[PDB]
Design a binder for this molecule. Structure first.
Ligand code: POV
Ligand code: NAG
Ligand code: CA
Ligand code: CA
Ligand code: CA
Ligand code: CA
Ligand code: CA
Lengths: 394, 394, 394, 394, 394
């Protein structure tokens, strides 16, 4: 009886076009905040943050007021979209095809004319995802909000701290914080200044998934490549091992392209890490070819250089701690015996070449092993957030 | 005649904005339930449950009542969206881009003013999918429902048991149950408490598909890796077999990434199982390199250590149950014969090294076979639901 | 003049909320049928049938009637959505995110008050796709239609045979038929019975595409695996051939997962067929290892068992139809000659082992060839629709 | 002043439900045409043509007429959707989920009551894509348009030639033409005939992209397979080459499945071309096994058949243009010499077998080379549009 | 009080259908510009530019004017869609399924009747993406805008320079500029000329991502192929290396097809670059077969041609800087010695053939290395924007 009566009274002569101020010269104060419930998706390839947010808009409507002693029990009323004036606050950096992802809900108004509006929404925003340090990256995604059509002389937008009390954690992103800033800009369209409120979602990637599915594999594929330097040359499988490892690694790096954006702001950390890993496998194939050249050297070919004889078989090797009728019968047997002696000298020359191959193989094992460790450790720890990541996620 | 007459009468002065209570101070009781018809999709990568549900809302409208003796034959009326007051019950944890997936249908009202509203919908909800025990995982997906704008002082939301009598089973998920709980929370927005109703869909993954397409393959790819320990070394294909098996396995694990979310709450069970499988193939390649080192050992190189001579050729081997002119002619033939004897000693040394390779190869066959079984059995049965899964799905 | 006049008259006092019956106690008869124009997509992974349908609804509106002698030339009128009462017939088992895929069109009404409504639509329905016999599978997809809000006491839904006269055949699915059934169910929501009409689209997969792209390849990859049993062992490539074939086959089976649903109702026919094919390649690698063990047997190792000497070199082999100073010089040459004789005996032992490898290789060629044929023929013909498929598609 | 005045006058008593004819018995003539601006996508897997079209509808509204001497300067007026009667022309064979893709725009009306309506739209239509001759295929995609609810007695739909003057060429499809045909059909729903207008978009695939990315590769993968017949057998890599080529080819054919529909109307041309290519690689592996069998033949095994000795080493080979104490010492040396002679005879037998392998290898090189050329040329030129394609695209 | 009063006054008798001109004969001047905020996506496979734009429309409404001395403090008013006349400016070359991607916002009107309308939107436009020079390509994407229904006699559309002052740079595309052009065309539909405004977004691809992920790999896969010419032939792995490299490269080129459109306007630059790379690997396999033919030549086969003996072992080689009872015993030993001499001559012939293989191998190393460099450098630098790209991105 009193609710029906009040609704009929509150709409009499009410225009949702009118900004609901008592004094038309003064701006209307709109308090804008939001509640962050969930981060639904961070698309690094499309540069789009998807969040579940409850926008919070509160203002005062001069015309929607009543004495609660005359409509007893009616402390609040509710109005749908199109029936009450609302601030036209939009997400400026929207990525939604519809642009406005807000789900329009009721505006709750109490007797003193205070209006509360909390529309939910799945918001897609355009966020510059800096993948320079991926997977140890921290992201700062801005959500800029302001009135589209009402400038600062008509709508005085103020900011209230964002609420994260009902935030649901994400298994992939750690919410560092959601600081907000109110600013007033000028636009070429418009001499009047237009205030906006920007909430910067600060997000730390949780690195357990990427550590075990992307970074530890490369170590394993880098360790497999090093096993070529322990395969004997006579096995006949050092190129099979090395080139198969590089095939696997190339396929592995293709799968990684699915996640990164095709941008040129910087060369990511994963790309540098891949470059190091690529180098280990590519140069182990090059070195493997050299080792096979030494192993399969023709004993009747070019004699072993003096530099090769000393740098490998002496210095490196020590460092590595490797180390009538009867006359005619005589002629035939002597030819057979001299032939055998020639084979003995030739295979001794081959043995020297094979030993040099082993020394080169062992030298490069140590060199590639150490260089693998330094590049892995150096590239990873160059990330500012690596130490934080291992302490919090591992 | 009486239906036309009643519709004209029931809408006279009716305001869909008014909460349809006789006493404005009292809250309106809304009974909320739902019917679960089908689970359409569980997206573990996007963390979203898609269900086909018929929401069930029933309340009493004080103004939509008539005497059936005056409108004979008219026992019920129906009203579309916008013409009758409805509770603004939404899915709080919605993942739909539109947020509200409800398909608006009629409200059915009988003569005593009781209103029934059963809107269908394809609902997308944000469900935390715990993949710690995947593929033997049970999921608890919450569907939280409440009035967006009406707090507890205005809308007294009560819960009624969910209906699963028209539930259509899913080939992938077994519906354990759909328990529901009514709760009343406070929000930072609002001093007034807002009641909600949360239905927890409890779902057990049916594991036949994942057992045959994801878990039994790993056993087969783990068994293929073990066959390297039965290949002769002279075949020249033990690295080809081992490294090809690991290429296959890496490709296999790439395909598995398509299904899991990139989250860091925990390391899944499939990841641990893959880690065990990875270890078998990776260490069988490492052991294969060692076996080839033994097999291809240079007979003029470092003599066999005493530890190697006893630990392998004696202990392990027994355990494994393996086990003038005429003077010049004399000089030539004696050199030929002594040369042959030197080859005999050298190939005897090689035979010892080759036999040690066989013992190491057989030792690691047993060790990797047993360790493969324990890790497979141990990792799988560590899942709480493994025993239930095999009894119900296999 | 008469069309304008009639439209003004027909809408006077008309309420689209009112069920258009003369007697409010009696139900309104609605004849429901449909026209199937095309099957657009059968998504076996999402379990959703997409069809192009023209729903057919016809009823009688008591208020939309006129004498054609007073509005000459006006034999029919047309009304858009919202202006005329329509039955709220929905697809119960809808998979569309909007739930209602119907495109709202005009209702055509003639002078006697008969209303015809033929809204087109791209309908997505939830169909249980039984892949037990894929690719020789027949599907029965139900399309259940009924009034959402009007029960049997208010809307008497009758069924009329579906029309397929403008059906456009699908290159992948053969329309067996579209039988329909009217039924009346009770729901927990509602004491009143609610009639529905279910049209069961019966669809036979056309198997030419799947025969040539999925079943004949497996035969070719099963035939390639058999070629390992004709490769000589000295070629050194029997593991390369066998393990490469299994790599190809594994990749091939990954591509097949894209089409099947991750369900556990049954193990499909293609899975069983893959299991047979998997067995041929996996056991040919196991047998290849055994053949290489025999071929590369150490002539100074364990003597050939008596069971091996008879079961292979006799029975199987026959069945397979294979089959002073001068004294010192004497000592040296005799050692050389005796050494050569020892090599002759040892290589004779090796030749026996190599021959046993050939017999085992030929025995398994026949066994795997026959077993390959039986499993291929047996698994395929176990499908009830295999004979029909080959006669109609091949 | 005169525009405002005219709009108020033209809407007085106007009903958008009324067909705007002076005589209600006569049908209304609607001229239907369209403008083809672009072909946006041809989805051969979903069988859907996406086009950018400007529909062209023109008719005469009897009520929207004025004297331009009384509203000077007002030669035309414009009306939005819902305010003026429009023909309900739809795309019958629509594939859009909404069914109607038309973007509703103004209707332009001049003083004589002539109405022009040119709504743009991104139209998705169901087109039967005949892939029998892909990639040298010509497509005929129908776009059928007619009034949904107005039959021939009420709306006389006439056709006007389609406009392609603003057509933007597609890099993949060459617009042969867009002929149109007006027809009048009967439907089971309706005794009244319903006229339709069907525009057949005739499209020729431009084959440069598919020639270089799909057809020339197969030639290269067919040429690589032929190189197995020039590899020496002692290289030990003829199975590695052949089986790797077939692995590559299988992966290549998987990528091709992404483009073709899973239909059984016919076996496409690319499938036949793949079958030829598959045969070359598969039979080159089979022949490679036979060549290795000949090369690795046991010299103490079955003697060379007489058919083999003549068909290969003579006919084919010519055609191919290949071609006391001292007595005891005597016994030992004679055994050594006789042993060597036995090796010479045995390796001579092996040399004959190795030469037969070379002849078979060279015979199959020529046979597979010629057969490769004929199948490539024969399968490609069997397409009716192959000659046109090479002249226009190459 | 004055805002409420003004809104009631401004809408009195206002018709949003009327073009708001004082003189109905004169056209209405509409100033059209836009603001480019971000380029969201360039889809080269679908030929669609996605941009975030703020359209800028300004005109004068003759009826929406007031004296600010009578409504003090009210300097501007705002009107939503449907309440005020707006120009129906559309994107002609739209690719959006809805066609109109504009988000409708308020029109801001000041006291002198000047109207400002700045609707935001995510616009999808049909852009011809010329991939002739990809990845060093510059794109010119047109965005054509004009009134759909108002021709030049009714709406005089003028252009204002586009604003890029709030443009957010894209990590992949460098905004060269956004020039605009006003033009007036004639259409077959319409005798009246229709003005349009076309803004050409000029975009330069940033090439760092494509240089490191697509162009440098090909160099690495081209360098790996060259390593076959340094592998010894006795290693037995030159076909394994070469054919594995080509497998990797084929897989690499499959991944590249995901990005390019299936168009035939031209053969892209990446395709030509791939053709060069393909040639290096394919001809290195062909040359590898020839080298193996030389290496494995039968010493009892066709003698070395005179051309081969001079062109390789002399010219190329120098250029490359390579370089009673006792009588019977005599017969046996002489046969053994003569047999050994025959082996020495035969292996000397083999050594000559093996040396020729090395020379051919070294000759082709230099030839393929130089030819690889020229094709890489020549194909890349043939792009007009290559020099600009390396200076700006590298
Ligand atoms: C457990 C993991 C495996 C861990 C390690 C590899 C296991 C095998 C190494 C030992 C082989 C035996 C040997 O002979 O070693 C030699 C070299 O050994 C060294 O000096 C260093 C060997 C370790 C290299 C570390 C990187 C391995 C690759 C990554 C591995 C992970 C791959 C990925 C894992 C899935 C020394 O012995 P020697 O030949 O007697 O020396 C000659 C001296 N003499 C003539 C006087 C006798
Ligand atoms: C505007 O109003 C002021 C006072 O209200 C008056 O003096 C002036 O003449 C008016 N001018 C116009 C626009 O008629
Ligand atoms: Ca992410
Ligand atoms: Ca699932
Ligand atoms: Ca299908
Ligand atoms: Ca196409
Ligand atoms: Ca791009």
């Amino acid at each position: 009886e009193f609710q029906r009566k009040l609704y009929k009274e509150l709409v009499k002569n009410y225009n949702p076009l009118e900004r609901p101020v008592a004094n038309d010269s003064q701006p209307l104060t709109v308090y804008f905040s939001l509640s962050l419930l969930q981060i639904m998706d961070v698309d690094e390839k499309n540069q789009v943050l998807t969040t579940n947010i409850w926008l919070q808009m509160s203002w005062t409507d001069h015309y929607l007021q009543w004495n609660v002693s005359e409509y007893p029990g009616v402390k609040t009323v509710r109005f749908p979209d199109g029936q009450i004036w609302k601030p036209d606050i939009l997400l400026y950096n929207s990525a939604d095809e519809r642009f406005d992802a807000t789900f329009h809900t009721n505006v709750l108004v109490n007797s003193s004319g205070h209006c509360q509006y909390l529309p939910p929404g799945i918001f897609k925003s355009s966020c510059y995802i800096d993948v320079r340090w991926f997977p140890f990256d921290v992201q700062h995604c801005k959500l800029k909000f302001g009135s589209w059509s009402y400038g600062g002389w008509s709508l005085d937008l103020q900011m209230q701290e964002a609420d994260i009390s009902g935030y649901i954690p994400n298994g992939e992103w750690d919410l560092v914080g959601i600081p907000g800033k109110r600013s007033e800009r000028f636009y070429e369209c418009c001499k009047e200044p237009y205030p906006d409120v920007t909430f910067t979602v600060t997000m730390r990637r949780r690195t357990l998934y990427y550590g075990l599915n992307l970074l530890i594999p490369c170590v394993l594929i880098s360790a497999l490549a090093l096993l070529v330097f322990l395969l004997p040359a006579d096995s006949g499988e050092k190129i099979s091992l090395g080139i198969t490892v590089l095939l696997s690694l190339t396929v592995f790096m293709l799968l990684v392209a699915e996640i990164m954006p095709a941008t040129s702001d910087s060369v990511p950390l994963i790309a540098q890490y891949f470059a190091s890993t690529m180098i280990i496998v590519g140069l182990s194939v090059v070195v493997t070819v050299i080792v096979l050249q030494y192993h399969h050297h023709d004993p009747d070919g070019g004699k072993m250089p003096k530099w090769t004889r000393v740098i490998l078989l002496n210095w490196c090797a020590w460092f590595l701690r490797m180390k009538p009728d009867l006359a005619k019968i005589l002629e035939e047997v002597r030819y057979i015996a001299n032939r055998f002696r020639c084979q003995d000298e030739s295979e001794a020359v081959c043995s020297e070449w094979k030993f040099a191959a082993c020394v080169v193989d062992r030298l490069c094992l140590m060199a590639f092993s150490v260089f693998t460790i330094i590049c892995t450790i150096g590239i990873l720890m160059s990330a500012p957030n690596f130490v934080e990541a291992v302490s919090k996620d591992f």
